[PDB]
């Protein structure tokens, strides 16, 4: 028989929504998920899945379905995918080349980009090296470009590694906030629990 559902609403509707440099993660325990509810909804801008055919997601069983969440510049949203590179795919949140989860992204211009500018959402540049898959970089070490080490000093060739977005109420479909949620599946052995509605 049908029973409790998964907390998709808690992570989709939600409230003040995690920035990108520390992308929010949520583990979904034993539950039943209704993906068709998300599929049929037209509010979503892009619903692109790199694993199995979305149309029958409701007929496979997983164990450890993860949900990542963050916010991106509207134009630069096609970087949440394997291989792609950039400020959101190379330094902040890079999917593994072998990926088996869907990516969902929808516009939220009205909910953000206040008249005075949101200027709260932060994105990470200036990483000493690359980023391994599914790596969160919450540290705030001051970056340098060669020269001489700066021991917490701030100045030329020693920069803070985070920047604030420039959301404005009328920027365009390009520079508008987009909320992205990555539903990454998993079959890490052990009994499967996250099955279809049946």
């Amino acid at each position: 028989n049908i029973t409790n559902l998964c907390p998709f609403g808690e992570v989709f509707n939600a409230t003040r929504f995690a920035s990108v440099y520390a992308w929010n993660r949520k583990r979904i325990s034993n539950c039943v998920a209704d993906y068709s509810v998300l599929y049929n909804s037209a509010s979503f801008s892009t619903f692109k899945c790199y694993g199995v055919s979305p149309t029958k997601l409701n007929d496979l069983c997983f164990t450890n379905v993860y949900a990542d969440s963050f916010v991106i510049r509207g134009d630069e949203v096609r970087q949440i995918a394997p291989g792609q590179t950039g400020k959101i795919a190379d330094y902040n949140y890079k999917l593994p080349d072998d990926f088996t989860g869907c990516v969902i992204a929808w516009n939220s211009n009205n909910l953000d980009s206040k008249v005075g500018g949101n200027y709260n959402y932060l994105y990470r540049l200036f990483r000493k090296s690359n980023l391994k898959p599914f790596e969160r970089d919450i540290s705030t070490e001051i970056y340098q470009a060669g020269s001489t080490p700066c021991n917490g000093v701030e100045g030329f060739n020693c920069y803070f590694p985070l920047q604030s977005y420039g959301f404005q109420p009328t920027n365009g479909v390009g520079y508008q906030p987009y909320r992205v949620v990555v539903l990454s599946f998993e079959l890490l052995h052990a009994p499967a629990t996250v099955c279809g509605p049946k």
Partner: antibody
Amino acid sequence: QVQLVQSGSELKKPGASVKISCKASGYTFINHAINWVRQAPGQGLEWMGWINTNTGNPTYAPGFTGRFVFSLDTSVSTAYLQISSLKAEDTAVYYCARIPIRDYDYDGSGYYYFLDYWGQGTLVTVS
Amino acid sequence: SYELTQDPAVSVALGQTVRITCQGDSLRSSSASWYQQKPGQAPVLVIYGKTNRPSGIPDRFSGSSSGNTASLTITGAQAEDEADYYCNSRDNSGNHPVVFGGGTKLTVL
């Protein structure tokens, strides 16, 4: 001790091609774009283009196709400029520049769109 | 979005504060940066961010921005600046991520 050094002066006849090399030392070369600029005697600098030192795909400024090719050797940390089908009105001094950002779209703030360190530059002359 | 006009005729007193002005219609919602270029030598920056001096020579160089105008300023020892000063800034319209102004030929008696 960041240091960018170009190749020496190059002489060639009109219509041929010129290869220009500039290499950078003292920092992680892979984490900085390489910008290009030209200057003619008595005339101000003009933007040429940039190379993302991760893939290489340039974004040439309008009208600079075919005559200019950008390349990079990461294993040696060097940048190369090819100027084929040269014209007498192309003699100039060329500089390659580093930028604190990997590319230009990375930083959407506009507070780092500047070139920090340059080299001596290469004089290309023909007749 | 195409050029940043300037004026290459700056020479005033050789012993007083000197100003360099740049006008650009695409400088309100953006930043600016200032270089110097001694004849032939490799040019290097003198101001980044319009306020933050560099480690090179942060002694007698200052910068300010007022609306569409960018202003560089020198204070003392005006000599040793027989040079050419150039500007940079972000740009819009998806045509040129950066552009360069005409440049100013700072000459001091």
